[PDB]
């Protein structure tokens, strides 16, 4: 019983490791957002300054 309890506990945690891989892909997209908006504001300032 206690081996089967701990086995179901490990399984249900591994199903949530799939959700941590989802939050990493959301966080990666947030690191795309700010990089390429900053590189666009930079470029629009250079296109106004000039």
């Amino acid at each position: 019983q206690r081996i089967m309890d701990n086995s179901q506990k490990l399984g249900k945690l591994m199903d949530v490791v799939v959700k941590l891989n989802s939050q990493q892909n959301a966080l990666n997209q947030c690191i795309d957002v700010v990089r390429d908006q900053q590189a666009l504001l930079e470029r629009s300032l250079n296109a106004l300054d000039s």
Partner: protein, 38 residues
Amino acid sequence: IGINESKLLEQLLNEWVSEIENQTKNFYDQAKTIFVWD
């Protein structure tokens, strides 16, 4: 403005649909105003 590399195409389409309906109202009310000036 350049389109943001991170934006979802669903967000961008709904954003542009809202703006085209805002522009649709303003086109008809500006043209209606021009017609009164005629």
